[PDB]
Enzyme design. Structure first.
Site, short mmCIF file in Angstrom:
data_model
loop_
_atom_site.label_atom_id
_atom_site.label_comp_id
_atom_site.label_asym_id
_atom_site.label_seq_id
_atom_site.Cartn_x
_atom_site.Cartn_y
_atom_site.Cartn_z
N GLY A 183 49.74 -72.76 5.39
CA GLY A 183 49.86 -73.19 6.79
C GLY A 183 49.92 -72.06 7.83
O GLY A 183 50.27 -72.27 9.01
N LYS A 195 53.53 -84.95 -4.13
CA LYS A 195 54.35 -84.81 -2.96
C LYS A 195 54.72 -86.21 -2.42
O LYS A 195 54.91 -87.11 -3.21
CB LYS A 195 53.60 -83.97 -1.93
CG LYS A 195 53.59 -82.49 -2.26
CD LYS A 195 52.99 -81.71 -1.11
CE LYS A 195 52.91 -80.24 -1.53
NZ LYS A 195 52.35 -79.37 -0.50
N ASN A 202 50.97 -82.10 -8.05
CA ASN A 202 52.14 -82.35 -7.21
C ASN A 202 51.74 -83.32 -6.12
O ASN A 202 51.09 -82.89 -5.14
CB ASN A 202 52.75 -81.12 -6.53
CG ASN A 202 53.99 -81.53 -5.72
OD1 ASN A 202 54.43 -82.69 -5.74
ND2 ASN A 202 54.60 -80.57 -5.07
N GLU A 248 58.87 -76.51 -0.01
CA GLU A 248 59.18 -77.50 1.06
C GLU A 248 60.66 -77.88 1.18
O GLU A 248 61.17 -78.22 2.24
CB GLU A 248 58.32 -78.74 0.86
CG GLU A 248 56.87 -78.35 1.18
CD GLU A 248 55.85 -79.27 0.55
OE1 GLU A 248 56.09 -80.19 -0.22
OE2 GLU A 248 54.64 -78.91 0.87
N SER A 268 46.60 -72.63 -2.66
CA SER A 268 45.51 -73.57 -2.53
C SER A 268 44.51 -73.45 -3.62
O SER A 268 43.65 -72.60 -3.55
CB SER A 268 44.69 -73.49 -1.24
OG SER A 268 45.58 -73.47 -0.15
N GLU A 272 54.40 -69.54 -5.49
CA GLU A 272 53.84 -70.11 -4.28
C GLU A 272 53.67 -69.05 -3.25
O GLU A 272 54.64 -68.42 -2.87
CB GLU A 272 54.73 -71.20 -3.68
CG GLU A 272 54.99 -72.41 -4.60
CD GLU A 272 55.79 -73.43 -3.81
OE1 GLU A 272 55.30 -74.15 -2.98
OE2 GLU A 272 57.09 -73.30 -3.97
N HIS A 281 60.82 -76.12 -4.91
CA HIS A 281 59.56 -76.08 -4.27
C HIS A 281 59.77 -75.53 -2.88
O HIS A 281 60.82 -75.70 -2.30
CB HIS A 281 59.01 -77.52 -4.19
CG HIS A 281 57.61 -77.53 -3.68
ND1 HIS A 281 57.30 -77.47 -2.32
CD2 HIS A 281 56.43 -77.42 -4.38
CE1 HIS A 281 55.95 -77.53 -2.22
NE2 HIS A 281 55.41 -77.43 -3.44
#
Lengths: 249, 249
Positions: free
Chosen positions: B172, B12, B10, B96, B212, B166, B94
């Protein structure tokens, strides 16, 4: 006197390889005998086809949108990727993005500024809705929009800005804008620039009209004092776009 | 037994012509001796470069996002334009996009369904946030997400779906996911499919992990029972991606 006019094709979310290559072919065969800047804004997908095949030297290609920085923003395209790809024009703050994708005055202003800081030519869209037009809030609204953008720029930056006025009140509402109304909105924008920024900036500034323009009404619209060209929707997918460019003579 | 694994890059909102052509070069020189499906999801802009230069026959290219129909949606790209361009894989929902661009379960479900109705292979993303993980709402959340997608599909449609988990709670947040936790989430998804859809659908379904992954931890993660591959972020821009693919043996 008028500054150099602009005929901008906003293809929006449309196109296929075949249909667009045909259209670009017509474009390439077209005699454009006067000083007009033609701008083709395709989807991110078709940028390469477009870039490769449009050979007419009066046409530049543009992106319909972007975000300021690269990164973890799945599905989005940033200004830096556009520049690397060699795209120097962009449409920002279009009404569809303001209505559907959460763009406020402040977001638009920020993008315009980034674009401008990186060397793009921006067509920045502004416009009021039906409710706003009806309650007589046209001047308040549009000027509030412009001022948000203006708040981020330096006088020199105006050399890269082009303003497009979208009569949102007349788009999909069953309402109709007349050339006179278009003129009354552009004169409002230009006076603001004049008083606020400078009669020098104001006289060089292109103000495109972004309502419904077809090849029938284009000339009457261009004839208006403060109209410098068009941000065309639907007709930009048709051969008729050629008649619209000819209308800016 | 495991179904055929997937290694998905990905990219991004990232890339430049030079850097990406270099990466695609490494990819093209790579021996991939087992049955893995490699998927490269670039920005809309880089799709053509990608499509032209990736010649390795174990790699397919994919789009990071799309909307269902063509039209007046300035700045967006639709499924039909992607298909015409010859792109048959897509990433949808996704995290995001769910966090920043207003995608709810219902919007994701609709897109997945359109994509599926048009013949794409979809990687559909699902995952819970920190607050959700902490209050012990993991199962409720993820299953609520899956069920929204599932509500729109026919049993046959599952053949085109790939699910990516995910761990939003760990992205984060300064929190760290262990392989065991990844396994506990995938086993939850797969049991739901089994009970709700069928042990036939459930046993063929790929469930990719999308936290990750780097080339150091990839193998331990793949070793887990219900992990069928990765939806890789950051490391997919690095040569290290090659080590991640080798990890799915």
């Amino acid at each position: 006197s008028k500054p150099q006019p602009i005929a901008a094709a906003n293809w929006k979310c449309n196109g296929s390889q075949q249909s667009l290559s045909e259209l670009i072919d017509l474009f390439n065969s077209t005699s454009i005998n006067h000083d007009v800047q033609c701008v083709v804004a395709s989807t991110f997908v078709h940028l390469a086809m477009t870039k490769e095949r449009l050979s007419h030297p009066k046409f530049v290609i543009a992106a319909q949108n972007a975000i300021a920085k690269s990164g973890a923003f799945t599905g989005e395209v940033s200004l830096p990727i556009l520049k690397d790809f060699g795209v120097n024009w962009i449409v920002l703050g279009h009404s569809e993005r303001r209505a559907y994708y959460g763009e406020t005055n402040e977001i638009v202003a920020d993008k315009v500024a980034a674009a401008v800081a990186s060397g793009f030519m921006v067509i920045a869209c502004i416009g009021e809705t039906l409710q706003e037009r009806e309650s007589g809030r046209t001047a308040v609204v549009v000027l509030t929009q412009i001022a948000a953008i203006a708040k981020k720029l330096k006088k020199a930056d105006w050399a890269k800005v082009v303003i497009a006025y979208e009569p949102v009140w007349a788009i999909g509402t069953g309402k109709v804008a007349t050339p006179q109304q278009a003129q009354e909105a552009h004169a409002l924008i230009r006076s603001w620039v004049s008083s606020k920024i400078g009669a020098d900036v104001a006289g060089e500034l292109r103000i495109l009209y972004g309502g419904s323009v077809n090849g029938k009404n284009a000339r009457t619209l261009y004839q208006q004092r403060d109209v410098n060209g068009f941000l065309v929707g639907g007709a930009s997918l048709k051969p008729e776009f050629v008649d619209i460019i000819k209308a800016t003579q």
